[PDB]
Amino acid sequence: DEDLRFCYDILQAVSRSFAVVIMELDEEMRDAVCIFYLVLRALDTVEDDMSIPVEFKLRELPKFHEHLHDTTWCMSGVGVGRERELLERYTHVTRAYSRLGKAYQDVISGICERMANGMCDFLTRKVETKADYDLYCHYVAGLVGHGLTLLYVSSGLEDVRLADDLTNANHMGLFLQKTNIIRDFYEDICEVPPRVFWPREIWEKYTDDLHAFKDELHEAKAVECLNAMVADALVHVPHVVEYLASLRDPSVFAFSAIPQVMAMATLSLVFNNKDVFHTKVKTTRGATARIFHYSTELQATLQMLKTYTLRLAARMNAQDACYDRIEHLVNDAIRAMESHQ
Amino acid sequence: DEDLRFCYDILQAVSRSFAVVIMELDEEMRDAVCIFYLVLRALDTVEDDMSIPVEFKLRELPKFHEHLHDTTWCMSGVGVGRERELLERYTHVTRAYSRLGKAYQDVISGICERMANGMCDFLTRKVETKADYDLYCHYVAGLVGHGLTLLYVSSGLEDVRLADDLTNANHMGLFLQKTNIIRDFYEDICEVPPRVFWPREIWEKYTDDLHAFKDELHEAKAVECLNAMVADALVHVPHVVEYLASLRDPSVFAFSAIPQVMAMATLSLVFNNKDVFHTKVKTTRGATARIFHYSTELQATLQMLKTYTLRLAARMNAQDACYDRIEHLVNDAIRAMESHQ
Amino acid sequence: DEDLRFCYDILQAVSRSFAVVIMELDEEMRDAVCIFYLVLRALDTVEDDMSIPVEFKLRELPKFHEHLHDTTWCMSGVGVGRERELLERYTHVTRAYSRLGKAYQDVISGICERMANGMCDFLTRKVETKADYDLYCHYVAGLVGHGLTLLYVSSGLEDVRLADDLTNANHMGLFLQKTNIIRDFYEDICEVPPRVFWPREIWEKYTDDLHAFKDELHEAKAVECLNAMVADALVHVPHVVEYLASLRDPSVFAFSAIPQVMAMATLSLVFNNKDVFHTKVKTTRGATARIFHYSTELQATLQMLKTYTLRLAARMNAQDACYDRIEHLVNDAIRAMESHQ
Amino acid sequence: DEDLRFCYDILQAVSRSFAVVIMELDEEMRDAVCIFYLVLRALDTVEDDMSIPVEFKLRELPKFHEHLHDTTWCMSGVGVGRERELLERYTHVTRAYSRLGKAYQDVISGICERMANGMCDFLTRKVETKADYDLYCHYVAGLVGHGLTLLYVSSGLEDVRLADDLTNANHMGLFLQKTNIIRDFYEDICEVPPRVFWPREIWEKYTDDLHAFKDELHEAKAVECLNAMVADALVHVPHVVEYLASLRDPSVFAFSAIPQVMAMATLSLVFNNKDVFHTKVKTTRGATARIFHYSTELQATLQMLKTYTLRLAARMNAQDACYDRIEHLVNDAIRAMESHQ
Ligand SMILES: CC(C)=CCC/C(C)=C/CC/C(C)=C/CSP(=O)(O)OP(=O)(O)O
Ligand SMILES: CC(C)=CCC/C(C)=C/CC/C(C)=C/CSP(=O)(O)OP(=O)(O)O
Ligand SMILES: CC(C)=CCC/C(C)=C/CC/C(C)=C/CSP(=O)(O)OP(=O)(O)O
Ligand SMILES: CC(C)=CCC/C(C)=C/CC/C(C)=C/CSP(=O)(O)OP(=O)(O)O
Ligand SMILES: CC(C)=CCC/C(C)=C/CNCCN[C@H]1[C@@H]2C[C@H]3C[C@@H](C2)C[C@@H]1C3
Ligand SMILES: CC(C)=CCC/C(C)=C/CNCCN[C@H]1[C@@H]2C[C@H]3C[C@@H](C2)C[C@@H]1C3
Ligand SMILES: CC(C)=CCC/C(C)=C/CNCCN[C@H]1[C@@H]2C[C@H]3C[C@@H](C2)C[C@@H]1C3
Ligand SMILES: CC(C)=CCC/C(C)=C/CNCCN[C@H]1[C@@H]2C[C@H]3C[C@@H](C2)C[C@@H]1C3
């Protein structure tokens, strides 16, 4: 039992806000989602640990799920901060895992493995094309959508038809990952070594070297690339909407909707905004407090999404290059919203 | 005795051209500049590789010179071709190094570390201004000039007073390095990632983007910039002439003069020549043979420099922006040349 | 209006010729232009009083335009002769200013402000390059060009299309300023302290000390420097031609053409004329009367510019270093002239 | 630790006052400023030895910065007092320097070289004009200002933006050097040879021979000229307060402010005072102890600067030749100050 409490404490420490979002769910769903989070979290620590050998990761990850049974396993010497602990004391995790609906355990193990291997793939090669981009996001966040959607069905709160086609569930994942990948460009490019996520295929058209955007001598082509990333992210909106509109349970909806609304808001703030290149553009807490408050039912979350996407549209002028394209994707989004209002 | 032979063989394989000039010098000093060449070439290769962490270099380069005193040291996998062969078999260099005059050993070591540290500085940032440009060239070539002038004095072949002021020697290095950077513009910008050296302080007056010079459309702006670049290099000629006129030894002179003449000849051909932007402009093998044959004594090499400098001026029109600047810089080169006849 | 009269009376006292040329304008615009002239002349008086400290100029210039809406304002310890009277009685100008259309007041105020700032910048540093030369001329002359153009549009006499690209207008002030700087060399360098406007970037090719041009010893290079300066002013002729041809109003035309024709006449006179280095070269009163008489319509003024341009060219021969440079520029101007015949 | 201790020991022996001020700095920064000071002091010792032939200085000074990489270099026949011990045991400085940190080494290296070249400019000529005076001040003090600012930034204690425009850093240095050159007029001129810093452009308006000011005979003009020198010095105050107002770190602030406040108090005391000509005017120990204690934050140091400027102002009568000009300079200073209160 003190295992469950450990998982929730490490979570509160590892992901501040998500530790609030997860509280929307009922303990049963809550327990699985928390386990699921930590499992993927540990897995993410290994992949990101720059201080250790690659061949080591390739020989580990592929069987990281296997450990979900060995209540004595753990990794002391990996990652930093809380993560390191999560691994060294990874026993409580599996100890909690052990006592979850059989079905839940299968989604976790399943998704974990799939993501692990997926991570390996991109651990060798690099992301240069948009196809690389989307596929990486699939392994990194899309699969979380698959897993969470499979958990929703399993639990019984949502209709099994929801898990039939996971295309939109994938879109939910990607939309969150891309919005975050865009917002954290600077924070990540400053890392040691520098972490880059923007696809070569997109920025190549705006510069010869990514690190160039740090110097505003290149703002022009910096923002212009930013707008192109924001545009590539908007593609998903229409699908996030459908997915949300298909949800029926009040718990699963709020849990699924809040993060999406948070991303749209963030996206409408980093769009056509050079501050992204020298700092972390963030939403105000009032704004997130309001988002967390009204994102409990379809109609209300639709008006918020609309409001944010419209504000993003206001960010530009006819002058701006990306205009015709953004206007397009935006109207494709509002249309999607209107058909559910 | 097998060690030295290895050096001259790899030297021959790498910089085939220089491999002939060095053969000009007497065996004792010849070994010096040979090992000197290789050390800096080894260093340059390390710094070169595009598949190595910046952080690695920024740490390993500044300590490179320390390996010269470790006959066991070598590097495993970096830099294709014969370069690979140097860093792996670097062993034979250190050996040879060990048996050279202490003074020689010190010159090589001093220049090396100063160069490595200069390269490090430019690993993090780019060449944006003329100062940046003159400083970058100083690190990768001007110092080579500093080093060669010290070996000359150390050797007794030249009068100690030669190393009193190393400003002109620095000019010698800069003159070669710039002619090269100018001449290899296309070959360098077509690299991955692109290699850019022309300073923004200069080209920003002719374009907003350097890659624009690859298209015929911008051919007019490309050339004007090329000429501004050629003007910047001519700044050094008077000093080169000064330096050559100060050498008293035939062997050292021929070795110092030949590369300089080759450079002016190349400069007179790339200047105001649009081919620079799609091919590698070079003098005819007959011309270099002619230069190698006669650049053995001051008067002869001065009238060859004069000749090329005059051929250069005859390529521009009274309607080319660079008219005044070039005509001035040219008339200035010739005066310094006439000042020694 | 005791004010509008003081203006014209000081105008005449300060500048005889302009006082005759301004009469080509119709009253409304004439008052505007007269005021405009005095405001800028006041700025000139300050920037030029070498007896007062720079701290004063950098303090007063930037906020000079503010005084325009402050009748009762004046300055009592700056300038000589009438200029000094202008400032100590500036109230007569601001009053008159006040009674002008807002459209006029605004242009005068705008240009005044930007010229002050230009003057403040070149008070902190000196003109070394051609770019500095062109920019300084832009601040003290070209800007006046812009101002007159806006006034012509604001009055309705000229079509608004005139203010689309103020580039040719800038060329207009630049041609007069340069021909003038060229002609006043001796007078300028003889003042206490010496005044210098020829840019180092141009004369550094002929001398190390511009004062050397006063001695016959250096006559040969002085003439070459003068001719290079002329070559530099001839660049603007084609544009002055374009600008003149775009004018539809007879008054604006006469007012704008006469000074340009006077300048060309003068330029043709100082060209390749060693006398520039010891005296003030001028056109005969007969020729300036002929010029004032015919510069009323495009064709006539077009043939006069041609005639002076041909005279200019005729004053040179093969041996002259500048021959090619000059012959090129001449044909370019002739062409633009015939290009409208 | 031994090398570093020798540096602080010689610093205290050689520059008593600065030895105290530097203790306002913390750790890495204090070491770097210490080495910086000694390096410029060693340089200054060589440039000032009159037994050293010019040709040597002209050749050795531009290379001085190069000795920083030579941990065996030193000099033995130059310097007075422990200045000799410094050059004799320079290996301590060079050695301590090698352990500073790339960023610090380059600042020190660059400024040293730039100062060295500037000194050479003035070993061949003398200060005649106001511009010469400023350039000279820039070379010996202004550059220190540039150097200190870079070191602040490189330490991270101040915002990187601080170094975008080093103009005010220059004024900071110039205010100190000028106040100093004024206060020490007599001591300077009373040497063999006599030390003269006051620029001809200023004093020739008051006398034909500068020594004339030692006689209470020419006294009247000595003070009128003294006042002119102070006026020229007050020019920098508004810029000095701008600089101080832009600092965020307490240590860096105290270190930067104390000397400026000392200069203003001294300046307000030497102003319009005949004693400057036969005695070294100083502030009371109590006054200087008060400045050291309160110059810890902006508001308090501004209050003190205000006090000393007004005290300076109130030492002249309306009948003084410098009245109006000093009054304006004073007002410029005070407005500036209020601008930050
Ligand atoms: C339901 C469905 C189909 C898909 C769900 C999509 C995914 C991948 C959801 C995970 C949500 C999380 C962990 C959000 C963190 S709050 P934040 O974004 O503000 O950043 P933080 O992790 O707290 O640092
Ligand atoms: C004597 C003195 C003061 C300075 C000497 C200046 C310098 C830096 C000389 C190095 C000369 C070299 C290596 C020329 C290569 S021939 P290449 O240019 O055609 O190209 P390659 O290296 O053969 O591929
Ligand atoms: C129309 C346009 C776009 C631009 C006009 C360009 C400028 C700056 C014109 C001002 C003309 C003046 C004041 C000429 C003086 S006659 P003068 O040269 O004989 O000498 P003076 O000033 O009378 O002593
Ligand atoms: C921070 C900044 C932008 C500029 C700083 C300006 C400069 C050049 C400062 C040097 C400060 C020194 C050495 C003061 C000593 S007091 P003293 O002259 O009374 O006694 P001393 O003989 O020099 O020990
Ligand atoms: C919510 C459950 C069950 C799992 C979280 C998914 C998990 C930790 C994935 C590991 N991969 C790192 C990429 N992290 C991304 C996800 C989490 C944050 C918000 C979104 C989605 C963008 C990124 C930061
Ligand atoms: C002649 C001895 C002793 C050394 C050569 C100096 C060395 C290998 C410098 C490494 N820096 C890379 C830039 N290389 C430049 C140098 C060699 C080629 C001709 C010149 C000078 C222009 C460039 C191509
Ligand atoms: C005609 C109106 C509106 C203003 C006059 C322009 C004015 C006096 C500018 C102040 N800046 C000094 C540069 N003065 C130059 C201009 C006037 C004279 C002939 C030309 C152009 C060369 C110089 C002497
Ligand atoms: C503050 C650091 C790091 C160094 C001091 C800079 C240094 C020794 C300059 C040598 N150049 C002679 C000009 N010396 C002047 C400076 C030092 C004293 C106070 C001010 C400023 C007036 C003069 C006496």
Side-chain angles (χ1 to χ4, degrees), chain B residues 273-312:
Chain B
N273 182 345
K274 44 165 288 179
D275 297 333
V276 169
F277 298 102
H278 64 70
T279 184
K280 166 181 178 184
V281 170
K282 46 137 180 293
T283 60
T284 77
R285 46 182 173 165
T288 92
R290 191 187 304 118
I291 296 168
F292 270 71
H293 182 75
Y294 292 111
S295 286
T296 65
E297 74 94 6
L298 189 58
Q299 297 316 301
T301 125
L302 290 178
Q303 57 190 83
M304 280 204 274
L305 280 179
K306 169 100 73 78
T307 296
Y308 280 114
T309 297
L310 283 184
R311 287 181 170 171
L312 181 166

Side-chain angles (χ1 to χ4, degrees), chain A residues 144-160:
Chain A
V144 185
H146 279 196
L148 287 161
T149 293
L150 285 186
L151 285 189
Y152 297 152
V153 176
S154 165
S155 77
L157 293 173
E158 290 300 318
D159 189 317
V160 55

Side-chain angles (χ1 to χ4, degrees), chain A residues 191-194 208-209 215 217-218 221, chain B residues 55 126 128 193-194 196 200 204 208 211:
Chain A
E191 241 68 300
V192 190
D208 65 303
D209 181 52
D215 170 48
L217 186 64
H218 303 179
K221 298 322 199 74
Chain B
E55 31 285 316
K126 320 292 179 185
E128 312 267 40
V196 179
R200 174 178 293 272
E204 90 197 313
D208 56 300
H211 289 74

Side-chain angles (χ1 to χ4, degrees), chain C residues 53 55-56 59, chain D residues 325 328-329 332:
Chain C
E55 66 226 45
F56 178 93
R59 183 196 309 140
Chain D
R325 188 183 169 189
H328 288 301
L329 287 172
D332 285 308

Side-chain angles (χ1 to χ4, degrees), chain D residues 27-173:
Chain D
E27 338 279 76
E28 322 182 355
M29 171 135 274
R30 184 167 48 189
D31 296 342
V33 170
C34 182
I35 306 309
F36 187 26
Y37 176 95
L38 292 180
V39 168
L40 273 43
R41 185 65 191 259
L43 172 74
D44 187 75
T45 303
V46 176
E47 184 266 61
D48 201 57
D49 198 343
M50 289 310 101
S51 66
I52 291 171
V54 175
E55 293 61 45
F56 178 88
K57 294 180 175 179
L58 243 44
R59 182 248 302 182
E60 180 54 59
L61 295 188
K63 297 156 55 176
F64 200 66
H65 72 279
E66 286 188 354
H67 305 320
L68 292 172
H69 303 313
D70 189 348
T71 45
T72 77
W73 189 92
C74 57
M75 238 167 79
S76 305
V78 186
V80 330
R82 307 192 63 193
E83 286 185 358
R84 210 192 203 81
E85 196 181 331
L86 170 57
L87 284 160
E88 289 185 309
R89 305 175 64 187
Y90 202 73
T91 291
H92 282 130
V93 183
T94 299
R95 228 180 301 162
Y97 171 88
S98 70
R99 295 178 290 237
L100 279 183
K102 213 57 183 69
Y104 288 147
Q105 292 183 298
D106 314 312
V107 177
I108 292 164
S109 193
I111 302 294
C112 176
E113 175 177 12
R114 293 176 67 191
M115 177 165 298
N117 285 152
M119 292 174 105
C120 292
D121 182 334
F122 283 98
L123 271 173
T124 61
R125 56 185 179 117
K126 29 201 290 67
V127 182
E128 308 280 61
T129 64
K130 286 193 156 197
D132 283 354
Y133 183 39
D134 280 19
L135 184 58
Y136 176 72
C137 291
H138 166 75
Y139 285 134
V140 304
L143 289 181
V144 184
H146 284 208
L148 287 176
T149 302
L150 268 345
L151 297 185
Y152 296 158
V153 170
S154 189
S155 82
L157 295 190
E158 295 303 325
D159 185 66
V160 303
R161 249 75 288 279
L162 199 70
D164 298 334
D165 191 318
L166 297 175
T167 293
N168 291 342
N170 190 65
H171 288 286
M172 287 275 288

Side-chain angles (χ1 to χ4, degrees), chain B residues 100-117:
Chain B
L100 287 173
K102 196 199 198 315
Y104 288 162
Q105 294 177 300
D106 297 313
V107 182
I108 294 176
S109 185
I111 295 301
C112 182
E113 174 167 48
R114 285 173 71 180
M115 182 182 287
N117 283 136

Side-chain angles (χ1 to χ4, degrees), chain C residues 18 33 36-37 40 44 115 119 140 144 148 176-177 180:
Chain C
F18 180 65
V33 165
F36 186 17
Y37 177 96
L40 295 194
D44 205 66
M115 186 177 284
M119 298 178 152
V140 302
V144 183
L148 291 179
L176 303 179
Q177 184 69 26
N180 226 264

